[model samples]
Target chain A: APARLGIPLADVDTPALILDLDAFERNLQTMADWAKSKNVRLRPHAKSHKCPAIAHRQMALGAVGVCCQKVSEAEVMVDAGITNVLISNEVVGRTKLEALAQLALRARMGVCVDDIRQIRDLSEAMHAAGATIDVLVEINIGGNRCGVEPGDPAVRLGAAVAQADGLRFAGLQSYDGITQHVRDPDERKARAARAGDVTAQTIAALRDIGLECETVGGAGTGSFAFDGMSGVWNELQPGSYAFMDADYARNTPAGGDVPKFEHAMFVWAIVMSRTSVGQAVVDAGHKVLPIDSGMPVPFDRPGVRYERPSDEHGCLVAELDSALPDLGEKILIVPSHVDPTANQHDFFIGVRGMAGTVQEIWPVTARGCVF
Target chain B: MRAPARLGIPLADVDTPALILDLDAFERNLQTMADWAKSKNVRLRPHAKSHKCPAIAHRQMALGAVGVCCQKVSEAEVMVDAGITNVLISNEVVGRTKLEALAQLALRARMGVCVDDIRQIRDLSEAMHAAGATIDVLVEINIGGNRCGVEPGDPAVRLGAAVAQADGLRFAGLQSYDGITQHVRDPDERKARAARAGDVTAQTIAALRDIGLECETVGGAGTGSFAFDGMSGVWNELQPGSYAFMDADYARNTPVPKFEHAMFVWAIVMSRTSVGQAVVDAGHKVLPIDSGMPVPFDRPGVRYERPSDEHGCLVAELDSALPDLGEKILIVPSHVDPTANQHDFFIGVRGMAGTVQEIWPVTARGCVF
Candidate 1:
């Protein structure tokens, strides 16, 4: 454990992941309130925190369930008593499909697919396991990374899911992952609107074949407002809203009406080396912090730039006007990205306020569930 | 635990995102490094931060390594708990928690640590005296890395004098690791950087000698600059970590020791939606992309790019072949240190096409404290 209960937050181990519980709860409640107002279900993505404690808290706030990206992650969530889960990504290969089908016997399992072969394999695995799963046809709205093309291709895949045994054609997953980072609010809104149209056309094409989507799930923290108001997606799958990152903070909210989420997650670090006047090296580096999106920002230290990260050392370069931290001084860092950064740690030291006592320690139960 | 392969199973049958080690190539790389150290007449202290496995550390020691170098005290503790006698924390340890832990660890094994601050030396001495243990203290000097270390000549001698006067501490010479010089790709520029480090190290050693402190072990250098440092006549102890598992980044370096690539991450193609793009199960979560994207082993014209948290996109050229779904592929990590830290076990096999031999636990992984 990085920290025990009742201890000050400053005493926690360096390079530890610390959670601002107050900000976290407010972010969760803000999302839940927005979803309730829009009368849409919330299946917040568990890939962000991978903590069952956070998942249960989301459920207590009236979330329908949670979304995962891997079968192993879903297995961890299901084993932790989370009754509903949707693997937002495809579960490929026979070994993983078998595991997913076996997990369905214990919870309300759902998955997304972009190809007929995946549907067929999933149906076979479900039959072998004597279980059934809710299947969603994932359509490429704007992001060309995953999912098949919308409209005609989506209709074909959804038809295959409807006809397949041991599978229920649940809905469509239309997520525009690229628009989630657009900086211009108008441009982002236009992109999101085009995505909603693509989803609307895919659903209309599916309805022409006498098929109804019981659950239309899509959208992320960056586009949840546009997705909720468009009346197209019934379920919102926003992960980073509960623990916003510097990358998501770059996104300009459409119409300035989106629920504001605080930066709840942090990487606690200590200045281990301050040999130079202009720079200080912290203990957190590539092994503990993620740099895929960009460099993590210091929480309140002005003009401190975390640029160079070796295996276990992060160089914090200070500007001319900024003073470098003394050796052994603890600082909080806001990660550049949330999901992968959370995956690097085993536990999150939870504090009520930023400087308050450590109230809880939550295990990242599904961390490194890459298989 | 996430042991991807079982004993006697085919290497191809292991789960996706598994860390695979070719024992034949690894042993060869190990012996080659040991031989280089023996020929160069320097002490080989292979860094454990690259593999983080005690089994590999024992293997290195069996082949005449003086000890192993770890970046953190907890990693040194894991090594000592696994019965390794000599371990040096190549990096400076700060704060009370780690200092106390380091002092406690010294009681059981021959523990060495680096320091650039006199306050750190005082705290470490206090902790050691409290724990009734003696620790070898090395005053680290700035030798071009500019990350950790005091000034080369006067500042380093001052810290060394403090270590010599402190209780329960032994002055163990200098740690002048030039991390920046280790990654310089061009052989000529790398040699120039190593020469600069040699000048700085020699000045510091002479200053300490002027203060009547006979240097015992002068340690520095990595896989990139080991030859330069070994022959530089300044450093007597060499710490090379990544040569055991040559990475895609190291493969770019020219005119160096010819160590074969030994470690790989086994991944399976999970999605093949596009004509030129195939998505694999391994991504930044398993294979880090900080240094660079992982290279597809033995696949010509195919490149790994655009890695998300859980999926890596393998982009193939028009003439190249795309892997079908469920097809297994080997990926050489971009950087070996953090890449090895991402996994729990290394599945060692006889060859790339052989059966599973031994599953070595990365016991010191995540021991960043």
Candidate 2:
């Protein structure tokens, strides 16, 4: 934890993750309100923030549950009293399977699988633990990353889940992760439509074999507008909408009239070096703020660009006529992508506003929970 | 606190995404760097930021390293807490909060810090005076990195003189590190840049001597330019971190340094459905990709690409076979420093044997403050 409650934002430590409370609240409300109007379920991904506090807040505002990518992450959320949880990825290996089965006894747990061997392993683990869990067949929705083939392969995998002793065929996990970041609006919309169509056909195939899907889990902050109202996906699992990042901001909305989310997550850093007139080096770098998607954009600092990152130093190059920040001054940078950036820290300092005092210090309880 | 593996278990049974250290290769790396520095007649102070474990620091000191170099005050505290006699904060420690911690730490161990501003010097002097302790202060001269440090000749001399005049502070040396030239792929170009940086450092040393002051240590150099920085007759201390854990980025340097790939993240093939693509459990969160993606060390024709938050997509060649499910694969990280920073433990194993010998904790895992 870098700061205590009631401390001013100025007094917060450098190279820490700060969340704007006002923006975060609005972002949460906007999604909940929209999902209610569309008559769809919301199960935001927990991988974005990895905070149990945020997960609780999301559940408070009509979210069915939350989606986690790892077994360790689900343990944190479940331990924090989040009842309905889904390990949205394949649970492989005996260690993780045993852990997941143990967790299934405590909460309404669900998991995804594309291969038949994984289902057999999960079945054995659940039988040993004497617990039952919901299972979703993660179909390849054009991501080509994971999941089985669309129609027959998905139905075959879902049938395996039904035949297993301690497993229930929950639904389809049709998530097109590649379409979430498509820059072109038409391309994104078309890919979402195709994904929705594929998911609908897969559902029909499963119905042919007397299987009913209770949950159709997919869609992210990028493709929620199209998939949420598509009538095929009854549940939406968009995570990054809570703390919007700079990379997601680059996407032109599908309809161009969607409710826009503000960039709420920022890396608060201090200028540690100012030897040159046009350059200032901050204490935060790729170690604190990763540059996998793109470099973190400096907020509200016109004509200043962040470049040349070492382990703990970020170079801020200003325009010729622009004045560089003085030594020991504080600056806020919006991370290019918030998922990995937020995973690096242990806490998030929640600020009320730009001038308001710190309201809370939220613990990133699931950070580095990569088992 | 979450140690992934137990000692004396089969290495394959250890948890996936574990930081695996080839003990034999690491020992050879330590001896090689130590022997290289001894031959060049310069002090070797391996950077602790790469492997934040105090056990590694102790190993380096046992191999004739003068001390260890850290980038933050909290990291220095961890090293000293582990009973390390000497540690230097190789970067600037700004503000009163951290400086107070630094001065407090100085009472227990031989502490050193670098400064490029007079305000930092004044603040450090006040903190040390309050604590009733003396600490070494070095002027960081900007050789070519343009990130930190003051100017070369006159500016460094001025900062060095200020440190000498300040109370509870001893003017020890200079820190002239050019981080940009450290990754130059061309050997000749890297050598030439190292020479230029050495010339600038030598000029600063001369200027400090002219002002009736002498620098006891002149520290710089990384894994890429250590050979040139050590033999320049200017820098007396070498700070090479990534040499101990050779990464994919460092192996690209032409006429590469005498180091083998010792650090690897042992990941499992969690998914193997596609013909050409398989997803591993380790992603950018576990295996950082700032420099580039982690390389498949022993898996020929298998390439790692498109790393998501918790999944790394492993692509196979047309002629290569895709890894089966539950297959253990060793991956060499692109950049060793940040990759080592993400994990909590290092599972040490010897050679190709499937036996876990030791499990070391990353003591200063998140000591960035």
Candidate 3:
């Protein structure tokens, strides 16, 4: 029923990427102010929403830096002239290490390290390049995925960095990837406290080992409140805060109502087929967004559920008594996962406000970082 | 690991960004998998989830695969359309719409699906009966991977019994998979995990056999723990898909001797900002990072890092750099299977000297549900 560009939602083209500018700016400012109030640095993770324009806005709002998961991301960031970028994940193999070393030569670059072989590769590349790279030792704070063991193992990695030439042991990178989706506020707080404990232990161990841990970085958008309150992470990296998605929206504050971040990312899908009685098909599917988290929620249509997905079409079933949109009607869908969803598109059609008026098309600058 | 000979596929000259698959390496990989399964005396049902390309499916079938396993109903539809007769939907089909689609497909193909609930069985039976088609249904048993499936002993037995009694469904066998154990780095740990998974499956099959029910097939296994699944008495079919294009994630598993890395995402250098850092044309948009970062090929001095929308940042020894602007680079991705799912076309690069080769369409590139 909403109007976009003076035309009703049913009038727009199918399968277009839509961005609500008003909600987006509000989300960005909210995170920026939250970081300011806590007296902590907010280096928004740009990997979640790989938009240079978004990074520019984050920088404008006193963001100390931006965190990128890929070296290719760093390239896009630097190309956009938004300096002070951190490659949050580890860069393996010689080619990636060299790329990181090269970025360090020009901009203020930081990288995360876990394995000794990775450190060795990084150090060797930096030494060969004659570049002093700032490196953060990643501590596996019970994620069980990547990173080294929290306390001694993390400190040892940090110590190794101090001894290695052409590399500076900048600090610790202890992120609780699991806690990012704890859902309940109380549970998220507890998970954040545990993460803080592990981070503190790692930092203390590093200090004991004669390594100066300057930046104790961690925290996602879900656990930013606890990370800020715990006083463990000196710098917070909450990427999804700027452009919230449905997956984060599902996270509740322990029986409390959903938090106040507006959904900015949406898939402007057109009703391809109004087959049968209540069933319709849209042009977004698994190729457009990841369903591993959950199905995309139909915006404004409370009773419509995105039932199934094929290569190019998403089957929708009307659960509501309301009238379904006719064929070729465009509907906005809040994607379950935003990162992979953004990856599927070449350009994000930024719209001003909820009106769906075209603003500017932003290129997904780092589309392929598979080095 | 077999080295690929001259990649003879010709490049189309149009430099549009497309995923490239080495046919020589792919054919070699297919033969290697076929030979391995033959040696082990195990039936091969290569999971079609990886490269939904019909050409890849035909190659696997031509190399002695019994059939193909599809994770989603839509994927099965794609395989069936490509002339793959024997297709198994490895996952459960819950909703009415999906069940109806599955039933319709069963009419034309040797359709098999894994079921965990009686409700799903009833729905599938009704749909199949209405469609005048019958389907082979496997009772899915939960074996460590708790994403879906019911408990093996009673729940699975009940589901299997229900399918046996259903008018339009047949009790195919047991479907139990150790999804997490596939990534265990230690061979012993992987074997031990598979043993536990196999035990759960074996116990359920034993219980079903006690009831005089015929369990024709037991399906499960991945590129990582296929060997253990093959050795287990419970498993008659191995469903290893990533064997064709071994990824860094699959490489983390205990090495299967015959598996080869045949797929690599080819990208080009877009910019050179400084002597130290260079940027590639690919980023998170082109390559997925769910498993980990992609491994760079050949450029030992350079390291690929942080990915953005359209660029990949490469760190290299500025003092000893050789890469120039507009240089094309082939990135050996950490996870080859998922990365291939992003693009629509695969540039089938052949021969040495990195000459232009053939381009194959990834028919099911966007087949995501």
Candidate 4:
């Protein structure tokens, strides 16, 4: 799936994941500038980008390492020479726990834990590998997916983590994943404020147990402003800010503007079929892109409805009079979701300048590292 | 991106949200299709675009398949690289770069390409002949389903004629599929759609005959319409990809299916919110949500309903049936093709699905070029 470098963007194959390097650079700086102003450490999530090249760029732009959702993903990050990595999600299986312990030997590692039994297992894994892993008591904070309850449970898990061998209690991680994509700015602000409040309350509760809360993190691309201003969440784990997608574009900020993050990622597809009334079909379909957030909107093609995705073909139908893409004609599609779309692609064609030349063909290093 | 499970491991030890193959069910499914194809005198070109596994493709070949049908040139490249001798790109190739790749691939193994345009036929011929590679060219015709094919009559003939004229190309036959009819709940309606596709196949064959271009292969029929094509005698090659996996959508059809759902996404219940509600670590990102939500396999009282990117919610109809935390649950996906695309490996299990037997690479998982 690697693209031959230095080709014109037009010569690059269709259904390719194209990263606008210009926009991506701006977005990386945007997050860095915001993190600098807000005084929170930028630990951008790698689950969205999956590409170690982007992660390296993020670190070069002054991130406190990176945050990943899986141990294998963290391994990929470390293998690519990223020194510090955090598993921002709970590890469940023995294989994954051992993988975490093994990876800790190579990089400074941390993982989330919600249950006491997990802490014991993590301890055994770490002790078996003769390694230490930072333990973040994943706060339920009404994030409601996986974690302990906000108040005393965080302290209890932290205490257990501290008591375990080869484990270091490293504060709490609070993020309501459901709040990441809230459309209404006021609602997102309300949730971000609440997430920060819960982080603060839990950190306070951690101190009551004679523990110092080192890091309280959680904010996505949508509510970074609100969460950063809270002063309680010292670390930011927003992933999508690096390559904003169409779904995030629909999010309205307080003054009803689009997401501060620029739209940087796109799927370059070609019309493989165009006939029979008002439809043109592209070679990219469900496997090439994600449709859960909704169907991809046709870029630079107004009124062209991109729908009817099969395994390998996406149907494009528009008004009969509308100028449709000719067969073999490439068109850009803004993917509905960034993370899984990155998962679907093997390489990201980083295009630079207005002439759209291929500058980088970065492999999505951890695309399927979802162990 | 390696295989999630190793051979000889307990199935429970396999990682969560892994694409699993029930070897018992898979072998039975393979045998049934082979037997059925033999009885019908049809060439079985099992679509590798479904499983995308070379091991499964090899098994299907050993079970009397003529070759595999790949949906993309990159898929064919993987199949050929894996020592598969014959392959057909069921989809069309348009770009010069991809056309050249397809042409170059013909040097390694027996390869086929589809064309519905005269210009494409010319382009393909130039590419293949220049590479000194002989390739099978199937004239894709619109047979009820209207995706990437020319009309059934004269247009299909022109494409067929163009294929015959190509220097390094063989006019293999027509390729038409009615995927929409593959899910018709009503048997009569399903049969009618198949009959219409059969009619188009008949009409196109007639037109091609008039042009002195007799088709060496008449390819059509999927999991749902294979019976109709076999019964109608309009096809010599049956392309049933999902038969090897079947799916929730196919199982819901009224034909009293021949194959069981042999594939499943094994997910772990990472959260138990209430007595009646639990969440598994598999969703659109791991499983898939295009066709519909995946069904909770064999958990009679449990329902898999809502989903986030990485989690699936299971609600218990019967309070006693709620899955315990950290328990693994198997889900039968509604669609197999896209679901297969999400995973990198298939954890094939034996011992009545209790132990891992083989770990097959989804070598063509990201082979969509």
Pick by lDDT: which candidate is best? 2
Show model 3 residue runs off by greater than 4 Å.
Answer: A1-12, A254-259, B1-22, B25-369
User: Residue-wise lDDT of candidate 1 within B88-136, one digit each (tens)?
Assistant: 9999888898998998899999999999888788889999999999999
Candidate 3: C-alpha lDDT: 0.73
| lDDT (tens digit, per residue) of candidate 4 on A1-371 | 54576777788788899999999999999889878877889999898878999999999999998998777789899989998999887777777788888998888898887777778888999999999988888776655566767788677778898899999998888787778778887888787777777778888888887998687777778766677778787888989888877788787657523237777899999887765668888998988887878888887678787887888999888786456788788888889988888889888889998437888989887877767
- lDDT measured at residue A309 in model 3 versus the true structure, 0 to 100: 66
Tens digits of per-residue lDDT for model 2 on A1-371?
77889999888888889999998999999999999989999999999999999998899999999999999999999999998998889978899999999999999999999999999999999999999999999998887778988999999998899999889999999898889899998999888998888899999989999998999999999988889878888889999999988889888766644567888899998888787788888989888988889888898778988998999999999877255678888889999998998898889899996735799898999987898
Q: How high is the lDDT of residue B198 in model 3?
A: 83
User: Candidate 3, residues B227-306: lDDT per residue as tens digits?
Assistant: 88888867988898888877767766655566666777666554443357656656656666656777666667777776
Off by over 4 Å in 1: A320-322
lDDT of each: 0.89, 0.89, 0.73, 0.84
**Higher-DockQ candidate among 1 and 4?**
1
True contacts kept of each: 0.55, 0.61, 0.04, 0.45
Identify the runs in model 4 with alpha carbons over 4 angstroms from their true place.
A141-143, A256-259, A320-322, B317-320
Clashing pairs in 2: none
Q: What's the TM-score of every candidate structure? A: 0.98, 0.98, 0.58, 0.95
Candidate 1 clashes between residue pairs 3 or more apart in a chain or in different chains = none
Q: Give the per-prediction TM-score of chain B.
A: 0.98, 0.98, 0.93, 0.98
